[PDB]
Design a protein around this ligand. Structure first.
Ligand SMILES: Cc1cc2nc3c(=O)[nH]c(=O)nc-3n(C[C@H](O)[C@H](O)[C@H](O)COP(=O)(O)OP(=O)(O)OC[C@H]3O[C@@H](n4cnc5c(N)ncnc54)[C@H](O)[C@@H]3O)c2cc1C
Ligand SMILES: Cc1cc2nc3c(=O)[nH]c(=O)nc-3n(C[C@H](O)[C@H](O)[C@H](O)COP(=O)(O)OP(=O)(O)OC[C@H]3O[C@@H](n4cnc5c(N)ncnc54)[C@H](O)[C@@H]3O)c2cc1C
Ligand SMILES: COCCNC1CCN(C(C)=O)CC1
Ligand SMILES: COCCNC1CCN(C(C)=O)CC1
Ligand SMILES: COCCNC1CCN(C(C)=O)CC1
Ligand SMILES: COCCNC1CCN(C(C)=O)CC1
Lengths: 587, 587
């Protein structure tokens, strides 16, 4: 038990000191390592109820039972007198750098998860390398260090969402007394892109500085695992070489899919291209119905564009479908057109003019599920029909890492693959929510278990989400249909209400469009199984409730907590209308 | 136990039916009452684990042990056969209206608490009257039904706060690509007031409609309790009369104080006057340092005004003083001037011109705590030096209701005064947080205990707050200094961080001004004693965390919950820098 943990810790830590906070001999070893700038993990035995037991187990490796004890990569180095001897004789630098491998850790993929894992491991003295490379899109788009979220995801998406939101603030201002005239103001796409891209540039540079300051080696190279400990790297000159590492973390993410039709790759774009596009897209077709599709369509319309969304079946598959329909209804009332139950069959009438900053023109042909035909011209066509990994480029199948039927890595609950020294984190971890804060938490927690003897696992359940459509949708836990499927309609109670933000009153916005509900399990003290809210700032509203749901909140916990007035969020503290009662939810 | 509860319930309920959901004789009595439009409370004995015991106790009043049993104001009316007999013989209307008093409930005060209490009591068949009157301010300002929050408080304050916030949205828009020029846009005060006042007007009317639709009598009259059951009312013609009631709820609120100096009442105004002022105040002095003072100063500056705040000692006395100082520092960097350690001694140079919509001009003289002199001219002087009840106008001291040294009503934990049939709720309840949602919860819960046999008490602990200064400040639980005083510095750990909203990046706003912290008790599993956040949308951020603190969240509960990205609120899920460590909190 304790003995099993200690063996695992000693074997995988790079440099680790067993100590006590009250021991001057430990302090003198700490000072020597600090001064030689040797980084290491420290385990303070007097701060663990298990400490006396661990102290005895140490003797199985060192034959001594006292503190301090220093280990390097599984080898007992010495006690106080012995470490200071190596220091005085200038033997200590060569002792702590001695390794069977080039690196204690190689991270393949320099995005949300991989950067977090790499920086946290180097905190504890692991010799670490982070590999990152960006395969260009079909039209040649590329970007800097940091992954999908930073460069072509959460960060630019929310900044352009904010640009769309400011449209409505400009309209609202006249009602609150400001002298501007909204009808005489227009938007400049290229000015917005320049500002967004300048912020992303500071993030790329910030990550390079952070790695250098943690003594992490950054290689801008394409990595391929060719045996359990060997990574083949190809650089920007196509020079090829091999590096070795003790532990391997796979963190290579995903990229957008294209449908298998004529013209798609040649004449359409994806979200990868949109966030740095030099010209306004113009009349735009978005094919797909995921949150990427709806978020992108939504801000394009708020920035004055003519936007159509082509929906194969339903909006936001996998989310609560009542809330998905209210989301789409809001977008349709505020400009966005929808081609429902429709798929494309083929896509060129005019070539893009990059010198004069003008889109081309495309003819899109498709059909509806009843057989009727679709045909219409667009300047830009954006595909948002999902994302997939490409692990055949990352992973020789003879290494023995097991993949599932979607090509994602099958992992134990501590992120281990079927090869004992190889782990996987982030979007390529089969079955996990595909989100940036999940990837960061997995990576940081994993590095602590490998190199600092930590035990805490990542908790993947009830992770909250927000869809940043023009009216935002936040959620935590089960959709209503999923709760009813799992427990039965008789055992589910739903409390709900419409609401109107106070900010919408003087501005003359709509009365009964914002909405919220709690899905509860009757037979478990009315436990809150799922929380759902459509309204402004939905992400800020939802976040704090995710802690309470993590601890098992019930309806009674929401009732006894007092609201903050005036806010949108306070409506959750006084809900009382149930769906079973048939009483209207309007304000 | 059960017997004691049942006696209390039967004695104070107006009309109550003891029933079972599976009994057709109960359903036929329900239908008869429903059809005669007799409102009543219902207690379903098969839905309480205590039901069999209650069924036997019923026989102490009726000599029968079966359901249904109908009671009116403490008197057993009959079983099924007997109730339908009264109905068939047209004796039932006169049986349920029979009362020793005019009303089952008289509520004195028609604001946040009083309106909530009155409407909830009439739900259960209590014959109810709500009295409301608005004493005019020194210059003659008055307003309609609904209390301080609706008319001269939370509602207009936040709407003018929103008007100030839109200033910064107008500036931000150019950076996000919109073609407006902020420097050429001005604000029109009277246009804003017209819109704010139109919304308040719809609230006044909405409350009158709601009372009529619940069969509550609304009397626009000044009430005075002259004996335990007698209320003297004076109407708008000074006609005087007396009405009687079984239960009395006092809910009369507070009004602004004036300092005892020459010129204050004659030439200054308070928040009561500001929210409907026909002209822009111009160059304005705000005397005081409470949240009212800072909120009002803050939006006046955002609307283009020249604003000074005169502070006797500290800002936001009673709130966390580190956060109070960051609040004030932000206001000072964005325009607001401060006269620190200063008090006024006397206040006319020009009379207000109401025909041409122009303020007057005043000379203010004062002194600093070291003895130096203050002297300066202002167009408007606003006093925000606290609020107080005036219960000598509400309450003959011979009734025997006990007051504390501040003139607030001393209450038991179920809101009872020292007179057994008289209760107090809202701002006049001594020792309670003075907030609109506390008053609403107290009133609704109290009406259910009086007239529906409920037992749940209002929980007054750890009630969250938000100060709507230009940069908002939300909090829940203990300030840091209060936690250190109660538990000792050694037992307190503080995790904190600066942050920057993603929306501030492209807009080039400040890097290290937003701030958050968790104050935790080491010896109680790092329990979160207090949460503090300075930033945009602080009220929406804080609300949901109040549920988790109500259930006793620890630091580990915050760590294991995953963030929503990108939001301000997610920074609470990854805090790690402690104050004890001395590590900088900057981004
Ligand atoms: C449009 C869009 C919007 C999104 N919005 C949000 C949002 O609001 N909130 C949220 O939580 N999530 C959002 N996401 C999801 C989020 O981007 C991902 O969940 C997250 O980036 C996953 O991180 P990761 O570490 O798994 O991979 P990534 O961040 O994708 O990083 C992987 C990196 O590895 C590189 N790489 C690949 N193969 C190799 C190789 N062989 N050698 C070297 N390097 C390689 C890739 O080029 C990339 O740089 C969004 C995603 C998209 C597409
Ligand atoms: C400027 C300002 C801003 C505020 N902002 C907020 C905020 O953002 N959030 C928040 O939670 N709280 C806020 N508050 C506090 C909130 O207004 C009060 O806590 C709340 O109104 C208390 O309600 P109440 O029922 O106790 O009394 P009130 O709402 O004051 O109602 C009492 C009513 O009784 C009437 N009355 C008095 N005497 C008699 C009599 N003898 N006969 C008949 N009627 C009588 C009064 O005229 C009044 O109409 C603010 C207060 C102020 C002053
Ligand atoms: C067969 O190997 C091709 C490798 N592709 C990439 C292209 C250039 N890369 C970078 C670092 O941009 C790294 C290698
Ligand atoms: C005065 O010059 C105006 C610029 N001419 C542009 C050239 C490019 N055009 C395209 C590509 O359709 C549009 C007209
Ligand atoms: C001595 O009694 C004076 C009563 N003052 C008020 C003035 C007029 N009121 C209203 C309802 O506006 C009610 C009575
Ligand atoms: C053309 O008329 C302009 C209005 N004249 C106003 C009259 C009132 N004045 C005061 C009260 O100072 C200011 C000048």
């Amino acid at each position: 038990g304790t003995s099993q943990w200690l063996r695992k810790t000693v074997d995988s830590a790079a440099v680790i000191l067993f100590s006590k906070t009250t021991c001057p001999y430990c302090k003198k070893v700490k000072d020597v390592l600090a001064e030689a700038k040797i980084k290491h993990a420290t385990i303070e035995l007097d701060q663990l109820s298990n400490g006396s037991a661990i102290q005895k187990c140490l003797a199985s490796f060192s034959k001594i039972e006292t503190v301090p004890q220093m280990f390097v990569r599984g080898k007992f180095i010495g006690d106080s007198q012995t470490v200071l001897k190596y220091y005085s004789n200038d033997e200590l630098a060569g002792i702590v750098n001695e390794s069977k491998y080039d690196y204690d850790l190689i991270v393949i993929g320099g995005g949300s998860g991989g950067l977090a894992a790499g920086k946290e491991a180097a905190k504890y003295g692991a010799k670490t390398a982070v590999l990152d490379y960006v395969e260009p899109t079909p039209i040649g788009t590329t970007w800097g260090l940091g992954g999908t979220c930073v460069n072509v995801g959460c960060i630019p998406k929310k900044l352009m969402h904010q640009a769309g939101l400011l449209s409505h603030a400009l309209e609202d201002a006249e009602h609150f007394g400001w002298s501007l005239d909204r009808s005489k103001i227009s938007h400049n796409w290229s000015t917005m892109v320049e500002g967004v891209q300048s912020h992303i540039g500071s993030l790329n540079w910030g990550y390079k500085v952070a790695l250098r300051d943690n003594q992490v080696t950054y290689l801008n190279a394409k990595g391929r695992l060719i045996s359990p400990h060997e990574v083949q790297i190809t650089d920007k000159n196509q020079k090829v070489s091999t590096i070795t590492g003790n532990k391997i973390i796979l963190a290579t993410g995903e990229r957008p899919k294209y449908p298998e039709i004529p013209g798609a790759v040649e004449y359409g774009i994806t979200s990868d291209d949109l966030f740095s596009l030099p010209y306004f897209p113009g009349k735009t077709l978005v094919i797909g119905a995921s949150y990427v599709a709806l978020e992108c369509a939504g801000f394009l319309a708020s920035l004055g564009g003519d936007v159509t969304v082509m929906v194969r079946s339903i909006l936001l598959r996998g989310f609560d479908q009542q809330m998905a329909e209210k989301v789409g209804d809001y977008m349709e009332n505020h400009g966005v057109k929808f081609a429902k139950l429709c798929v494309p069959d083929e896509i060129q009438l005019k070539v893009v003019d990059t010198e004069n900053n003008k889109p081309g023109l495309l003819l899109v042909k498709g059909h509806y599920t009843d057989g009727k035909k679709f045909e219409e011209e667009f300047e830009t066509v954006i595909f948002a029909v999902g994302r997939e990994p490409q692990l055949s480029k990352v992973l020789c199948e003879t290494v023995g890492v097991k993949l599932d039927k979607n090509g994602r890595v099958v992992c134990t609950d501590d992120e281990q693959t079927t090869v004992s020294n190889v782990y996987a984190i982030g979007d390529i971890n089969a079955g996990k929510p595909q989100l940036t804060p999940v990837a960061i938490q997995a990576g940081r927690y994993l590095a602590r278990r490998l190199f600092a003897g930590a035990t805490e696992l990542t908790d993947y359940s009830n992770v909250a989400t927000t869809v940043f459509t023009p009216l935002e949708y936040g959620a935590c836990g089960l959709s209503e249909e999923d709760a009813i499927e799992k427990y039965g309609d008789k055992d589910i109670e739903v409390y709900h209400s419409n609401f109107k933000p106070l900010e919408w009153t003087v501005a003359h916005r709509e009365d009964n469009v914002c909405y919220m509900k709690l899905v509860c399990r009757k037979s478990d003290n009315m436990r809150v199984l799922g929380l759902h809210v459509l309204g402004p700032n939905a992400g800020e509203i939802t976040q704090g409730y995710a802690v309470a749901i993590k601890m098992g909140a019930t309806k009674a916990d929401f009732d006894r907590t007092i609201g903050i007035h005036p806010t949108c969020s306070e409506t959750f503290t006084t809900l009382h209308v149930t769906k079973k009662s048939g009483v209207s939810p309007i304000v």
